[PDB]
C-alpha cells in the first residue's frame, strides 16, 4: 500500500523528531548529553531492547517482522510509561513521544489485521525496570529515546512490503 507507506513513514519521522526533542531537553536540563556513557548502566539495569531480527533487508520474514514490530512498540511504550514522565518539566515532551508511538503502533496493527497476520509473542527479555530514582528516570529517558531512534531506522525496511 502506497498510502500505508506514506502514512507510516511520516509517523516514523514524527517519533524520531520527538525522540530527538526529548534527548535535547534532557541534555539542556540535566546535562545528560551522551547516550553512549549510559549504555553499560542500562545493561546493569536490565533494560530490554526490542529485537527486529526478522526484519533484515534480505531474508525479511513478513509475519515475524510484523510480530516483532508490534511487540517492540509495546516494549518501548512500556519503558516510556515506566519513566513516569521523568519530571514535571519533561512530562509534555514525553507525552507527545508516547502519543506518536501509539499512533504508529495502531497503523501497524491495522495492517496486520488487513493481512490476516496475528501477532506472535516474542521470547521474554525479563522484567520491566522500575527506574526508581530521579537519575534513573533521566538517564532512562536518554537511553530509551536513543534506542528507539535506532529501532525505527530498521523499521523503514518492512514498510514497503505491506502492499
UniProtKB/Swiss-Prot annotation:
Post-translational modification: O-glycan consists of Gal-GalNAc disaccharide which can be modified with up to two sialic acid residues (done in recombinantly expressed G-CSF from CHO cells).
Subcellular location field: Secreted
Cysteine-cysteine disulfides: 27-33, 55-65
Gene Ontology terms, MF aspect: cytokine activity; enzyme binding; granulocyte colony-stimulating factor receptor binding; growth factor activity
Main location: secreted
GO BP annotations, alphabetical order: cellular response to cytokine stimulus; cellular response to lipopolysaccharide; cytokine-mediated signaling pathway; granulocyte colony-stimulating factor signaling pathway; granulocyte differentiation; immune response; positive regulation of actin filament polymerization; positive regulation of cell population proliferation
Gene Ontology cellular component annotations, sorted alphabetically: endocytic vesicle lumen; extracellular region; extracellular space; lysosomal lumen
Keywords, comma-separated and alphabetical: Cytokine, Disulfide bond, Glycoprotein, Growth factor, Pharmaceutical, Secreted, Signal
Glycan attachment points: 124
Self-association state and partner proteins as the record states: Monomer.
Described function: Granulocyte/macrophage colony-stimulating factors are cytokines that act in hematopoiesis by controlling the production, differentiation, and function of 2 related white cell populations of the blood, the granulocytes and the monocytes-macrophages. This CSF induces granulocytes.
Family statement: Belongs to the IL-6 superfamily.
Protein name: Granulocyte colony-stimulating factor
Organism, as annotated: Homo sapiens
Residues of the full protein shown: 40 to 205 of 207
Amino acid at each position: 500500500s502506497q498510502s500505508f507507506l506514506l502514512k507510516s513513514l511520516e509517523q516514523v519521522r514524527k517519533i524520531q523528531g520527538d525522540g530527538a526533542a526529548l534527548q535535547e531537553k534532557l541534555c539542556a536540563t540535566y546535562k545528560l548529553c551522551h547516550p553512549e556513557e549510559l549504555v553499560l548502566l542500562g545493561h546493569s539495569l536490565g533494560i530490554p531492547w526490542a529485537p527486529l531480527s526478522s526484519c533484515p533487508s534480505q531474508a525479511l520474514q513478513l509475519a515475524g517482522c510484523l510480530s516483532q514490530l508490534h511487540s517492540g512498540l509495546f516494549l518501548y511504550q512500556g519503558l516510556l510509561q515506566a519513566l513516569e514522565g521523568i519530571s514535571p518539566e519533561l512530562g509534555p515532551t514525553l507525552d507527545t513521544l508516547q502519543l506518536d508511538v501509539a499512533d504508529f503502533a495502531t497503523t501497524i496493527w491495522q495492517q496486520m489485521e488487513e493481512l490476516g497476520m496475528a501477532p506472535a509473542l516474542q521470547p521474554t527479555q525479563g522484567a520491566m525496570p522500575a527506574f526508581a530514582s530521579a537519575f534513573q528516570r533521566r538517564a532512562g529517558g536518554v537511553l530509551v529515546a536513543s534506542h528507539l531512534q535506532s529501532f525505527l531506522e530498521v523499521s523503514y525496511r518492512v514498510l514497503r512490503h505491506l502492499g
